[PDB]
Design a protein around this ligand. Structure first.
Ligand SMILES: COC(=O)C[C@](O)(CCCC(C)(C)O)C(=O)O[C@@H]1C(OC)=C[C@]23CCCN2CCc2cc4c(cc2[C@H]13)OCO4
Ligand SMILES: COC(=O)C[C@](O)(CCCC(C)(C)O)C(=O)O[C@@H]1C(OC)=C[C@]23CCCN2CCc2cc4c(cc2[C@H]13)OCO4
Lengths: 302, 302
């Protein structure tokens, strides 16, 4: 039985089910550079959240090893050429967060539709302006969804109920299967001029790094509103800021950013932009089930 | 009757349909309190919504007018007893807002869940507070809709897509027709202990003035989250203000108020409270979509 690290915030259900096979770990990560000489030197695995941006060296500094794995979304903190030193894989939990990012993005569609945070943020500033925050309805406006995996198909089944026409594009996914979850499929060329909203749930990829750039925004007709609760970057943040600045983008909702604590501050400060600190998988719920699924697909191989 | 005024901001959507059914009218709004008796001592009809409410007596000093009309749910601007017994009665717009208030309410449910405005206001203040807004899922949580009808049944079907078990209570509305949009019906007695969220759009009535008070709060779950996008009062603003304090109601979303611009500011400021200045009905989809009906039930009199 080898014993590992809770190298980040994770619901203690995680550790209890992690151990009732024979395998615990220490209750912390409050740290950063020079106290993480402690969790080094031993261990075989690691169980994080991601605030543990494991450096180029601190996966090679625990050379007691074979694999690691984190409860949630991707790994936005591991250089894995600098991760896979010997026999490494990293297990992730791509199914557990599936439902709650869908919840987050539909909430962001509705806010993009109305401007709910802007209106209360200055109501709390003490102002009764029943004239500036006049929104648009969702039913009958046209939504476009790029990529169509778990999350997007859940976003879509949730949002065609509001009366929205759902189109999209996934290269692999048949037009037949998109139709069989009510999202029409297109080549991107026509997906732009047809849309009142655009959300994406695309992974960060070269095909998709900045897959909404100055051209796509030049093809969507005026005032479209982009939501991004996927990976930071899939919307060209400068190009997005430009479309925002003049009329091409009525508003935009952004859960992720190219630089994760974004030190670029032009977008969030913008009037038509609504924000969140990567709350995509942030429910007591979602972290519960990804901690379980990591700590079972971990505690039962080898 | 073939002379009219819209004493309010009006999408000419109304006036155009008004005209060749047989009725000419003038385009002002800006108006004082006691001066549209000049504009309306020589014409007969009137269409208001909010601005410069039709008084109790601007029925007694405008010795012409005989029918009136409001773009919106209910009438929060006409003294209806001082209308009825001089032989004036009111056509209003009960159909236009149902869909855009239903949508707004579902947005406010989502924000209560995942704290989208609360998270954005500190993104805009430049703080990455990724653990204060660890929200809740909708899927599996149990929703309550007090009073059903237009907005209630549309909120119910819209919110069933998220996986919520949605119950409610309307006395008139059939238990058999209760089901026809998937809301079970129970008396409040049992609907309290059952709820993670509760929505309201019930009319203002002594039957319902302060229908959520310190008593109701003593029976539902704890940390329950209520939205009220109906009339100001149906939730006791003082009683709710206290409920927040105890964790008995974790969060709350309010579109309307007992006052108007409330000189009371205790609730609006609460970190776990989200707001908007009566935006329930404010998209010109819906607003002009009311402009159609008011000036057709006018031109379906002549
Ligand atoms: C551009 O090519 C694609 O979009 C196909 C693909 O998006 C990606 C293939 C699956 C993996 C993640 C293994 O690459 C997919 O099938 O789903 C991914 C998938 O596995 C099904 C995981 C992802 C990535 C972020 C969100 N999420 C869950 C499912 C989902 C839903 C989406 C979405 C992406 C995802 C991915 O955009 C449209 O709505
Ligand atoms: C306390 O008992 C009730 O709630 C009954 C009643 O809410 C009002 C009875 C219907 C009338 C207005 C004709 O009395 C109703 O049936 O709906 C009203 C109704 O007719 C269906 C008109 C209303 C009034 C304001 C909003 N709107 C649309 C429908 C609706 C939806 C609701 C709601 C109220 C309304 C009303 O509570 C939460 O979900």
């Amino acid at each position: 039985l080898r014993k590992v690290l809770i190298s980040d915030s994770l619901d203690p259900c995680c550790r209890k089910i992690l151990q009732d096979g024979g395998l615990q770990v220490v209750e912390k990560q409050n740290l950063s550079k020079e106290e993480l000489i402690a969790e080094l030197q031993d261990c075989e695995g690691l169980i994080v959240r991601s605030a543990t941006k494991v450096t180029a060296d601190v996966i090679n500094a625990a050379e007691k090893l074979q694999v690691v794995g984190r409860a949630g979304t991707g790994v936005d903190n591991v250089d894995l050429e600098a991760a896979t030193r010997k026999g490494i894989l990293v297990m992730n939990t791509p199914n557990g967060n599936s439902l709650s990012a869908a919840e987050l993005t539909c909430g962001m569609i509705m806010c993009l539709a109305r401007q709910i945070p802007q209106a209360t943020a200055s109501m709390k500033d003490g102002k009764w302006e029943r004239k500036k925050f006049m929104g648009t309805e969702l039913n009958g406006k046209t939504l476009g969804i790029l990529g169509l995996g778990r999350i997007g198909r859940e976003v879509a089944t949730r949002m065609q109920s509001f009366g929205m026409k759902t189109i999209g594009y996934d290269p692999i996914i048949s037009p037949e299967v998109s139709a069989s979850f009510g999202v029409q499929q297109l080549p991107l060329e026509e997906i732009w001029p047809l849309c009142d909203f655009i959300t994406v749930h695309t992974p960060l990829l070269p095909s998709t790094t900045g897959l909404l750039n100055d051209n796509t925004f030049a093809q969507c007709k005026k005032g479209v509103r982009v939501v991004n609760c996927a990976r930071g970057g899939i919307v060209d943040e400068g190009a997005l800021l430009r479309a925002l600045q003049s009329g091409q983008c009525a508003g935009a909702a952004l859960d992720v950013f190219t630089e994760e604590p974004p030190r670029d501050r032009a977008l969030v400060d913008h009037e038509n932009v609504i924000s969140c600190p990567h709350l995509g998988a942030s429910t007591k719920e979602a972290q519960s089930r990804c901690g379980e699924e990591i700590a079972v697909q971990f505690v039962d191989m080898v």
